[PDB]
């Protein structure tokens, strides 16, 4: 009937014209008279897609198994997202330009905006950061983090974990012993010590990030698999990072002397997976997992059912078993036996679900009660609503990390957190975006209504355990051995400390350090004189030297003189400004070479903890690149107020000579003498 030629349409045409004919114009058949709007009329839609900057145990398929030679089948989170989605559009010019002070100082701390869609100033990108002192951004007593590291988003996550009492107290606790073999746990401990110690100004994650980057050179396979603007891609990474960090830390806490494995208890989830099929015979496994990843279908009122399903779920995936090679759809059922003291939630969802979540009111529950019955974990909002053993655990929201996409459609990460105040028996809510810290109201904290905000990571903790106080490392007795002995994994001379001198509060020591540049600062200049800094400078520690300050000048013997031997494939060694070998690399290096592994950092840190004052040509630059800050009490240095800074070699001749290549100990020594001059000079 309808087949060509039909009587309806084709009756006029004697033979078919092919679509590929250019001689035959499309105008050949005119439209008849129309009294109404055409379908071809296009609705008033804006088009944002063009000029988008590209790139920001089973195989094959289940039911897709009819294939040509072509397909390679790995997918989802790693690359893109939901099928054929259009990428959001970001314009670089608008991205790199915006901030000086923002032109605003006081109004920047306002977290609420009258417009629902508008992104508040606090969430907006903060300016990048000679030396500049940013006072107005943080009025709280809790430190913020510097945005400049290899990948800054991690900060958001770390700050969160900082407020988990168990986590913090444990990791800071592990500083008491050596534990040099564990990079991440220790470095994170020191970082924790920074954020804790300074009720005040900012701390940097640089050493942590460096160590992590060095480490990446089953979980390692996962994060490496996820691995390939420089900073741009949060695509699925932060979730994965959460898993990697947690799991790795558990792996490392094994290596500590006591084998404490407290994390294994605290974040630990016994996961029971049962596979039902043939040719696998039967297989049942149980494994401890740090975090649970949430997905789902409704089969809601609020977040809890998602959690419940995450804890007990049966899913069907098509697998090939190593037992017998039969490849078929297999059914796995996994349930978790226990409820941890602290649990971490990784949100991987269809964006539609994110929409539905934004639609719901108070979708995130401030607190909930939960217990296991049968083999099935159950979680409900109120004690009575569940009936059972009445052995129930109270879980309160400790904090969460949220992704923010502003109007320019660039992506940043921010942290929401809760802290206990023992007096008044109260809770306070805080937001951390990089070096910006704001005390905020609960109602704003829980509100999911905002369209830019998407939840990424959510951390829940036990009510009784959360209210336990935070403890600084000072309460524990600390191992000072590395100060008194030598660990080196050639320099002329130096003398290790003995038990007699007793460095303590008031003790005087001298220090200087020398650095090597891992990266050069690169600028781009458009019209109208705007300095765009792309690829920021990456600097690493090279040499550290500390000499005795007891009895005034006294002994000329160095407390420690150390080379750090770090290999990131340096661009330039700055040999002129500071003597560097090069080739300090561990295998071929003739010098006392120690993997920094906090150890030099440990010397300086135990020193500053004991409260011994530091001397130098200037403390700030050096300490800033050592990734440690010390109170002004220890701070005193030679350089004096002059029309910026003052140069030491210049001052030496004035104080009576000088040479082109200067050992660090020399600068430190001369510095110490200069301080001695400064005291007696008085008026």
């Amino acid at each position: 009937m309808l087949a060509y030629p039909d009587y309806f349409n084709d009756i006029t045409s004697d033979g078919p014209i092919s679509v590929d004919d250019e001689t035959y114009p499309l105008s050949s058949v005119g439209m008849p008279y129309y009294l109404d709007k055409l379908l071809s009329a296009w609705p008033p839609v804006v088009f944002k897609s063009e000029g988008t900057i590209p790139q920001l145990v089973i195989s094959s398929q289940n039911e897709k198994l009819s294939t040509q030679e072509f397909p390679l089948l790995r997918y989802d989170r790693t690359k893109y997202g939901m099928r054929n989605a259009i990428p959001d559009y970001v314009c670089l010019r608008d991205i790199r330009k915006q901030i000086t002070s923002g032109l605003e100082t006081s109004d920047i701390q306002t977290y609420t905006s009258i417009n629902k869609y508008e992104v508040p100033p606090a969430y907006s990108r903060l300016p990048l950061t000679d030396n500049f002192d940013f006072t107005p951004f943080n009025n709280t007593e809790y430190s913020g983090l510097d945005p400049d590291v290899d990948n800054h988003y991690t900060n958001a996550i770390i700050q969160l974990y900082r407020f988990i009492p168990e986590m913090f107290n444990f990791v800071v606790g592990c500083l008491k012993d050596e534990n040099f073999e564990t990079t991440l746990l220790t470095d994170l401990g020191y970082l924790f010590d920074m954020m804790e110690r300074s009720h005040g100004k900012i701390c940097s994650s640089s050493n942590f990030q460096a160590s992590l980057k060095s480490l990446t050179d089953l979980e390692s396979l996962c994060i490496r698999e996820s691995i390939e603007s420089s900073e741009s891609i949060k695509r699925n990474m932060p979730q994965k990072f959460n898993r990697f960090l947690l799991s790795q830390l558990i792996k490392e806490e094994a290596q500590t002397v006591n084998h404490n494995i407290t994390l294994n208890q605290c974040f630990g989830l016994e996961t029971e997976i049962r596979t039902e099929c043939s040719c696998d015979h039967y297989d049942t496994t149980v494994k401890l997992l740090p975090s649970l990843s949430i997905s789902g279908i409704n089969k809601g009122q609020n977040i809890l059912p998602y959690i419940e399903y995450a804890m007990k779920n049966v899913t069907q995936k098509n697998s090939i078993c190593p037992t017998c090679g039969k490849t078929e759809t297999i059914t796995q059922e996994c349930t978790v036996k226990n409820l941890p003291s602290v649990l971490s939630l990784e949100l991987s969802l269809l964006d539609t679900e994110f929409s539905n979540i934004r639609s719901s009111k108070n979708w995130l529950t401030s607190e909930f009660y939960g217990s296991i019955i049968k083999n099935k974990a159950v979680l409900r909002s109120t004690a009575s609503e569940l009936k059972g053993t009445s052995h129930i655990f109270k879980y309160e929201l400790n904090g969460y990390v949220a992704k923010i996409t502003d109007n320019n459609n660039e992506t940043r990460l921010v942290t929401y957190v809760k802290k206990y105040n023992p007096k008044e028996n109260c809770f306070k809510w805080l937001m951390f975006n990089d070096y910006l810290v704001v005390e905020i109201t609960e109602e704003e904290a829980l509100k999911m209504t905002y369209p830019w905000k998407t939840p990424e990571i959510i951390i829940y903790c036990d009510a009784e355990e959360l209210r336990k106080p935070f403890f600084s490392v000072d309460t524990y007795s600390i191992n000072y051995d590395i100060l008194f002995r030598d660990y080196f994994a050639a320099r002329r001379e130096y003398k290790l400390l003995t038990h007699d001198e007793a460095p303590k509060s008031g003790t005087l020591v001298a220090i200087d350090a020398e650095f090597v540049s891992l990266q050069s600062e690169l600028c781009e200049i458009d019209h109208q004189g705007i300095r765009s800094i792309i690829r920021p400078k990456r600097t690493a520690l090279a040499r550290i030297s500390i000499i005795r300050g007891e009895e005034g000048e006294l002994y000329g013997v160095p407390f420690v003189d150390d080379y750090v031997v770090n290999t990131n494939h340096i661009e330039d060694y700055l040999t002129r400004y500071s003597g560097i070998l090069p080739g300090d690399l561990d295998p071929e290096k003739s010098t006392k070479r120690l993997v920094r592994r906090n150890v030099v950092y440990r010397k300086v840190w135990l020193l500053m903890q004991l409260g011994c004052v530091f001397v130098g040509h200037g403390l700030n630059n050096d300490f800033k690149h050592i990734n440690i800050n010390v109170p002004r009490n220890q701070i005193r240095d030679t350089a004096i107020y002059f029309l910026r800074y003052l140069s030491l070699r210049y001052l030496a001749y004035v104080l009576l000579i000088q040479e082109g290549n200067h050992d660090s100990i020399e600068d430190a020594h001369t510095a110490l003498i200069l301080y001695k001059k400064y005291l007696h000079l008085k008026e």
Binding site: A41, P44, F47, S49, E63, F70, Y75, K79, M82, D351
Partner: protein
């Protein structure tokens, strides 16, 4: 008879709000005014009305399918002088003007002479003059002229004050008018021929905006049963009449007030000096045109304004580039359309619909996946949306042979296929050919 429902322009506020990268649906395509004009042209040329053997000629000379244009007549008394015509040779139509009831047969030699002289001259902005001939089909012993058509052309008079919604007549345009008229004058005088004194508002038609001015009638007396130089200079005054008269009614034009017309006799230099809103250079030019001798030369007149001549050239060239751009884009749209037709032909086949994914075979799967990729678009946040410029990019890229690579994703989201556009074009064309035979 007319429809503005082809497509509504998007609201002005949106266009104002648009970011530089951001495009709107009309901007991808040909703007409405040009397409409407061209469409009206096509319709007006193409329209053919039925005819009677005895009321109107079946065939005349080399010409047929005659239809009268009843509306253009100054004759007022007798049936219309001018008719629309389709030529036998070449088509493209043309215009014909009838000259009825001639006293006595004029010799063919004279007609041949007139033809040779007026055919010899070729100038744009001067309506091309085609074959002239005498025929009996009217049985009035009638001699007729043939011109190029140049459809929907309005006289400057009709252009600004009446025919369309009234148009503002800014002096800038006046400059262009002056330049083009200067061109036709120079071109006709180059053949030493005399102008016709048809230079007044009427009979001077505009086409091809911005302002392409052309003279039509351009001398009819030579057909009929002072020296050359005298007339040749005399016309300067006529042009002056035109430009002055235009110049004075500008204010009347803006508020669409009724015009005043003035003859060259009424013109006073002081009155010219009196007028405002005009560039003193152009005023000086008008002064040159109206005043009596030092014979008036093309040299001096053109010598008055060099810069504005360059201005006119600039405008013309810019517009040319504009038109090229629009033409390129729409031709591209056509090709792309055909492509979409082939892609559509392969996709969604009824034979193919019994799997949850719609590919019948495994060979056809990648193209179908691609179809899903281009046409079935999902916004971020997970809501469906259809972009066009995306579609244009993918289709355009596919038409070419370029090696850019695509990650195509299955409807499971579990799986993917990696493919290069060259392989896609080859695959689509080969498959299409296979299906079609």
């Amino acid at each position: 008879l007319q429809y503005h429902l082809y497509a509504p322009e998007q609201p002005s506020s949106l266009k104002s709000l648009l970011k530089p990268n951001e495009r709107s649906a009309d901007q991808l395509f040909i703007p409405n005014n040009i397409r409407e004009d061209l469409t009206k042209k096509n319709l007006s040329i193409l329209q053919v009305f039925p005819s009677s053997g005895k009321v109107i000629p079946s065939i005349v000379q080399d010409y047929f399918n005659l239809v009268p244009l009843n509306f253009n007549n100054n004759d007022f008394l007798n049936k219309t002088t001018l008719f629309k015509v389709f030529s036998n040779y070449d088509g493209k139509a043309y215009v014909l003007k009838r000259l009825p009831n001639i006293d006595k047969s004029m010799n063919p030699n004279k007609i041949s002479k007139i033809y040779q002289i007026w055919s010899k001259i070729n100038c744009t902005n001067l309506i091309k003059f085609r074959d002239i001939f005498q025929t009996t089909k009217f049985g009035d012993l009638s001699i007729c002229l043939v011109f190029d058509y140049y459809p929907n052309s309005l006289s400057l008079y009709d252009y600004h004050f009446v025919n369309f919604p009234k148009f503002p007549i800014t002096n800038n345009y006046l400059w262009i008018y002056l330049v083009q008229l200067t061109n036709v004058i120079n071109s006709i005088h180059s053949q030493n021929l005399s102008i016709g004194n048809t230079l007044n508002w009427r009979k001077v038609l505009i086409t091809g905006d911005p302002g392409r001015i052309k003279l039509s009638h351009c001398f009819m007396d030579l057909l009929f049963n002072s020296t050359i130089e005298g007339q040749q200079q005399l016309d300067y005054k006529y042009l002056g009449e035109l430009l002055f008269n235009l110049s004075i009614n500008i204010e009347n034009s803006n508020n669409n007030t009724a015009p005043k017309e003035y003859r060259l006799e009424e013109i006073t230099p002081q009155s010219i000096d009196d007028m405002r809103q005009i560039d003193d250079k152009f005023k000086d030019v008008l002064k040159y045109l109206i005043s009596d001798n030092s014979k008036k030369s093309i040299h001096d007149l053109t010598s008055h304004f060099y810069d504005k001549m360059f201005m006119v050239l600039e405008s013309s060239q810019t517009y040319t580039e504009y038109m090229e751009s629009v033409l390129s884009r729409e031709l591209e749209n056509g090709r792309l359309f055909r492509l979409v037709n082939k892609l559509n032909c392969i996709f969604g086949r009824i034979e193919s619909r019994i799997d949850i994914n719609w590919s019948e075979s495994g060979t056809k799967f990648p193209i179908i996946l691609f179809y899903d990729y281009v046409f079935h678009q999902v916004d971020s946040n997970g809501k469906p949306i259809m972009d066009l410029t995306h579609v244009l990019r993918c289709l355009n890229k596919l038409d070419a042979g370029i090696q850019e690579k695509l990650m195509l994703v299955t409807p499971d989201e579990l799986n993917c296929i990696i493919i290069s556009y060259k392989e896609l074009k080859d695959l689509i064309e080969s498959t299409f050919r296979s299906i079609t035979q």
